[PDB]
Design a protein around this nucleic acid. Structure first.
Lengths: 165, 137, 191, 25, 234, 171
RNA sequence: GCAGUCAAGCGUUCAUAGCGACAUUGCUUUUUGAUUCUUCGAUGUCGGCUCUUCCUAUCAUACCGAAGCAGAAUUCGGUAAGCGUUGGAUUGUUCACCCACUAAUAGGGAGUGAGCUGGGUUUAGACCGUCGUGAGACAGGUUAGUUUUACCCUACUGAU
RNA sequence: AAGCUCGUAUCAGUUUUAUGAGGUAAAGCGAAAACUUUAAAUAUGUAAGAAGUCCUUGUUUGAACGUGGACAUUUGAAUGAAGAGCUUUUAGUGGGCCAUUUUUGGUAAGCAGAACUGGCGAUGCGGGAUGAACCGAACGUAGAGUUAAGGUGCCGGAAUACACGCUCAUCAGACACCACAAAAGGUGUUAGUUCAUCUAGACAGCCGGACGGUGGCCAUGGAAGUCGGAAUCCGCUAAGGAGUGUGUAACAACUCACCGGCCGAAUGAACUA
């Protein structure tokens, strides 16, 4: 910096003097076995009946949930692994926002895990976008964008994602 | 994940009339305790909310003066902001703030014991674990 | 690069003569005599002409050659000590408690006694080494002077004196009390 | 770091003086 | 040394080293001067203050004074008999010793031999040179000038320089309140005696300009006559 | 082995309407005549497209030293394809013959670089005629006038198991 | 962690084919110490009396170093395992907590499932819940329930 | 095995010759890398004579199938050797581990399923202190000689051999290696590479200079190069920043960066091993 100093976009007035194909960005994610993810839970005094299964991977569940009776249940999604809000980012702009999840639409590795709502890596999710403030031409204003999750939220609690723009 | 014109496209969307319809209904509704909610309707709520406060947040001093300039060796801060108007108003603005202090000691006397036990030089007893129950994880 | 041979020169004034068998070294002259053993050091000594003596290493590595230069320095110090002499002045500043320094001789053994340092009941004792002499200066306050032929003896003795009166668990900035070397010089002088 | 450097430029010049000409004519 | 060396003291100042291109500029100047200006002198000034030199140099604007390296100016005039710009020009260059100090002009000799005889200025005493003065310092509190004034004029010395007085200027000191004190009167110097390096710096510190600077010059060359003269003035 | 210098000429094959190809001479350092021929083909493939089947050796000849009495100063240029990318090297060796200088080089290179005969490629050995073209310091050391020095603490080679004298290293 | 930003360098040679350290910006919820009473499915056994030893990744004692270290008290760091590290309450459970003494109540390993036990292995009895047309089994929950060596070799402790 | 129906000049985990293919590109030049011809083994397949060739001209000029004749061993590349298939039949066995080479899909990192060839299982022996897969190795009983891999201070048979270098570790190394902790930290040592500086005197030391517009503008209780914010210019110069740091309430004084005198010959910086 001494050697550099030795030698010698455009915005409005009110915005300067400030600072800040159809390929999805993850095609082909690693495949997950069904034997991992689904831990077995045995039931009885003699622990001798199996049949209950616990989803160990993270889950979006719904808005409207309620558990079902313990005798009728089976596919247990426990409440510590139930994400409501994801951490979405934009390829343009360079700003993340913490946005609420609205659905899980496409899950790789089978149509089971879409239907349980298992977030994984690679999964494509409906995001509520209203803090960003996107407007279609037509003039309607937007609050449903599909986003792809970028990390494995087993291995750290945060669900990150990138908007499919 | 098979490439598709679906995605990138906008899924849900809302009408600019329908926002103006739903913003009014916060004003109207009215709960009724004999009624009870089954479903909610999926709605972009952050748009519909933000109602009119009349007060505002406090200003952000950190932007104008950091910390290093606010106090230190570096320290570029000769005079106070906002500072007083006049020395009549200063002496007015002391004498009530004295008596407001002198109140709170006479109040927190009558609230109390706690210091006088420490001057006498003894502590209050252990709270019994049964009064927890329960509580408990 | 492993130099094939390297040399130094030690220059002898007329007052002194210096005598070397093996690597044992003696210097004789007006003030007195100093002896040093260099058997560990592993160098060759040669005489050319009374006033000049040369020390050399043959086929020396870098560490070895470094040792060669210090030998010149050690021998020169004996020469300066024997003719010029060495004088060290120590001054002992106190805030609130006067420090009393006396010489007391116990069984012929000759000791420096420091009393009442920073109001301490303890008496610290430092033994004066052979061939160093301790006196307190006329027409100056608070001056103690250590003078002898051998450099290492005088300097080591002076350093012991200050370390004996080190402060403990009090901040150095607030408490200034101690003994220090104000000046290092020769007995003679005037030069 | 070499003694006889300035020969070898003239050697390469004189060797290439052939390979200019003897290709063409 | 591959390793275990002195690392040199890096620091990030503005000014940068001149090197060769500056040393050429003086060689180009000196050879350009000799044809133009008629008479040439070579002044010994082994010490100077700069605002003395500015006073010497402003007192004639047209007449040139070019300082620089001896071993430039020896080369510019000529060391040998063969390699030289003008005739008999090595004979002046052989004689010089201290800090030149080389002057060109187009002016009368009897001005210049008068001028540097009549010129004299006050300055410091400096090492290896006897000075006609002597100071015992007064033996309570020392002051900035140190007993060359009525003390009620002068401010006491700044405690910050007492470590310098203790270590470097040697003189035994201690401080009582802020102010620097000595018990008994320390003499620094005596008249008709050569000054040790430190005995100067004490006189510099208290700031006693009591020794005459005057420039002096031996040699003298003339282009039209083409011959050297050596003249004894001090 | 202990080394021998070798001339090696080799000329490609003749073919139809190509009479007398150019010949290509090299100065190989090697133990024996068999290795020098295999060395020669390895050099030739780098310079231009050839092989052992496509060409032939004309004339392998030994080259002895001209004056293996006289002590000479050599200056060898070397490069070697390692580790990492290659780089050149210039060492100066004081030795009686050329073949002795290359012997003492390969032992020096095998120490300092962990590198074999097959890796190292000698460019050109040169006798230095006049002194004070000797740029290196350790060779310039021995060229000083009236050179004397002692033996380097003389170690004694022990013949016997038991000895009665208390041996003096002499000196 | 994800998405970038600068760029000491790698990429056979190489600035602008792709990689890329040290730095560095984004939120995971309010800038005025307000509370923030959030305790959200460990499907696997450990826990404790007695007694020994080891590690150091040092809580205390020893000696040092650095801090606005005036004392006094303390924080951070260095060598250091010589020597210590406790008393109780709580099973509508204690993977913890609190209050009390204390110079200090540091963290671990080999533990002590044949030295002795409490929960849990764990069977036959019984009741309540859920499920089953039923025999029965389990989302549970509660109560009652015999494994008892040494006299052999070695080790250890004493003894001829 | 019992066999006998061949012991024929036929067979082969092989090479060469001819021809085919991936055509990777390294030759190579076009008509202005785009050609579109052609070359080296890298690897896989076919073919290389006894019913074999040629003349004559039937069947439905040519082509495929034929009628009748004449032509024998350098008989149609190399090297090897005789042990190939039958008809009946009848014992045991039917999933498995390690490495190597191709190749397809893969991340915290392992790795996964295909193809081939080795090794072990049924297999002792020499070495690797010890050891399923590592280095060597054609098991009747003895004798002599010479070696493999591995070794030659002592345990321990065999140089406390010879030669050139490098290394000092306050618990080196003697190696699993073509990895992991790995990328870097060191005023530890040696050898290199590329730029600089230098008898117009370098590098290191002391000694002297380091100045004038000026205490530059705002800022302020006070800031004079050095608590700060914007500029960072001109002059005289051998050289001297509207200032690298210590320092004063402010100045002062010292310091460096830069010149210069003394001394005298090599020295500095950044990389590689």
């Amino acid at each position: 910096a001494h050697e550099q100093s030795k030698v010698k976009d455009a915005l409005p007035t009110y915005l300067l003097d400030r600072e800040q194909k159809f390929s999805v960005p993850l095609p082909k994610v690693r495949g997950i076995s069904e034997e991992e993810m689904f831990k077995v839970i045995k039931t009885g005094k003699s622990r001798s009946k199996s049949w209950k299964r616990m989803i160990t991977k993270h889950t979006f569940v719904g808005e409207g949930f309620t558990r079902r009776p313990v005798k009728m249940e089976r596919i247990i999604r426990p409440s510590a692994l139930r994400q409501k809000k994801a951490n979405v980012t934009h390829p343009e702009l360079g700003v993340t926002v913490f946005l609420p999840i609205l659905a899980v639409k496409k899950n790789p590795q089978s149509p089971m895990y879409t239907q349980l709502g298992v977030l994984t890596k690679g999964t494509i999710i409906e995001v509520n976008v209203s803090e960003l403030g996107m407007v279609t031409a037509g003039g309607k204003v937007v609050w449903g964008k599909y986003a792809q999750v970028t990390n494995e939220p087993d291995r750290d609690g945060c669900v990150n994602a990138v908007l499919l723009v | 994940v098979q490439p598709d014109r679906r995605w990138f496209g906008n899924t849900r969307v809302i009408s600019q009339d329908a926002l103006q319809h739903f913003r009014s209904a916060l004003g109207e509704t009215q709960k009724d305790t004999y009624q009870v909610l089954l479903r909610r309707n999926k709605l972009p709520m952050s748009l519909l909310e933000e109602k009119d406060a009349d007060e505002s947040p406090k200003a952000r001093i950190l932007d104008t003066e950091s910390y290093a300039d606010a106090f230190g060796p570096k320290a570029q801060r000769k005079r106070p902001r906002l500072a007083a108007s006049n020395l009549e108003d200063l002496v007015k603005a002391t004498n009530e703030d004295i008596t407001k202090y002198e109140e709170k000691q006479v109040l927190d006397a009558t609230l109390g014991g706690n210091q006088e036990d420490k001057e006498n030089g003894w502590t209050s007893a252990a709270k019994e674990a049964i009064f927890s129950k329960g509580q408990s994880k | 690069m492993k130099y094939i041979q390297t040399e130094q020169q030690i220059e002898v004034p007329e007052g002194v003569t210096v005598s070397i068998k093996s690597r044992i070294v003696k210097v004789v002259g007006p003030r007195g005599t100093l002896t040093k053993n260099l058997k560990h050091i592993d160098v060759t000594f040669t005489k050319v002409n009374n006033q000049l003596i040369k020390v050399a290493v043959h086929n020396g590595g870098r560490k070895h050659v470094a040792a060669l230069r210090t030998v010149k320095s050690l021998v020169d110090n004996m020469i300066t000590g024997v003719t010029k002499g060495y004088k060290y002045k120590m001054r002992y500043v106190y805030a609130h408690f006067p420090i009393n320094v006396n010489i007391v001789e116990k069984d012929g053994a000759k000791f420096i006694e420091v009393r009442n340092f920073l109001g301490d009941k303890k008496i610290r004792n430092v033994p004066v080494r052979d061939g160093v002499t301790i006196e307190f200066s006329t027409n100056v306050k608070d001056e103690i002077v250590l003078s002898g032929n051998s450099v290492e003896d005088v300097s080591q003795n002076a350093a012991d004196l200050q370390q004996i009166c080190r402060v403990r668990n009090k901040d150095i900035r607030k408490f200034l009390d101690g003994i220090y070397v104000s000046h290092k010089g020769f007995i003679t002088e005037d030069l | 770091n070499f003694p006889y450097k300035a020969k070898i430029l003239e050697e390469i010049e004189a060797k290439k003086m052939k390979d200019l000409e003897e290709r063409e004519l | 040394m591959p390793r275990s060396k002195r690392s040199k003291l890096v620091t990030l100042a503005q000014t940068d080293k001149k090197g060769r291109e500056n040393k050429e500029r003086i060689f180009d100047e000196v050879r350009e001067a000799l044809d133009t200006y008629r008479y040439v002198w070579v002044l010994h000034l082994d010490d100077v203050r700069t605002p003395v030199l500015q006073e010497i140099r402003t007192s004639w604007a047209g007449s040139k004074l070019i300082m620089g390296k001896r071993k430039v100016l020896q080369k510019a005039l000529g060391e040998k008999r063969e390699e030289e710009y003008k005739e008999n020009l090595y004979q002046l260059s052989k004689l010089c010793s201290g800090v030149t100090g080389l002057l060109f002009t187009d002016e009368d000799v009897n001005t210049v031999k008068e001028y540097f005889k009549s010129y004299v200025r006050s300055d410091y005493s400096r090492p290896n040179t006897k000075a006609p003065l002597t100071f015992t310092i007064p033996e309570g509190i020392v002051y900035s000038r140190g007993g060359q004034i009525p003390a009620e004029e002068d401010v006491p010395m700044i405690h910050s320089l007492e470590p310098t007085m203790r270590n470097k200027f040697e003189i035994p000191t201690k401080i009582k309140a802020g102010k620097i004190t000595i018990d008994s009167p320390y003499l620094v110097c005596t008249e008709g005696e050569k000054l040790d390096v430190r005995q100067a710096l004490i006189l510099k510190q208290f700031g006693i300009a009591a020794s005459e600077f005057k420039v002096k010059v031996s040699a003298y060359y003339d282009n039209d006559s083409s011959t050297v003269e050596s003249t004894n003035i001090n | 082995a202990h080394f021998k210098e070798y001339q090696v000429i080799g000329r490609r094959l003749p073919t139809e309407s190509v009479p007398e190809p150019k010949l290509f001479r090299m100065r190989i350092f090697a133990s024996n005549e068999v290795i020098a021929k295999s060395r020669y083909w390895y050099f030739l493939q780098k310079l231009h497209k050839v092989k052992k089947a496509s060409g032939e050796i004309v004339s392998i000849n030994q080259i002895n030293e001209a004056h293996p009495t006289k002590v000479k100063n050599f200056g060898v240029w070397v490069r070697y394809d390692s580790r990492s990318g290659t780089h050149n090297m210039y060492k100066e060796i004081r030795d009686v013959s050329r073949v002795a200088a290359v012997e003492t080089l390969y032992q020096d290179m095998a120490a300092r670089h962990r590198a074999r005969f097959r890796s190292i490629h000698i460019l050109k050995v040169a006798e230095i005629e006049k002194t004070a073209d000797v740029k290196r310091q350790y060779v310039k050391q021995f060229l000083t006038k009236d050179l004397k020095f002692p033996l380097p603490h003389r170690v004694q080679k022990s013949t016997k198991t038991f000895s009665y004298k208390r041996p003096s290293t002499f000196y």
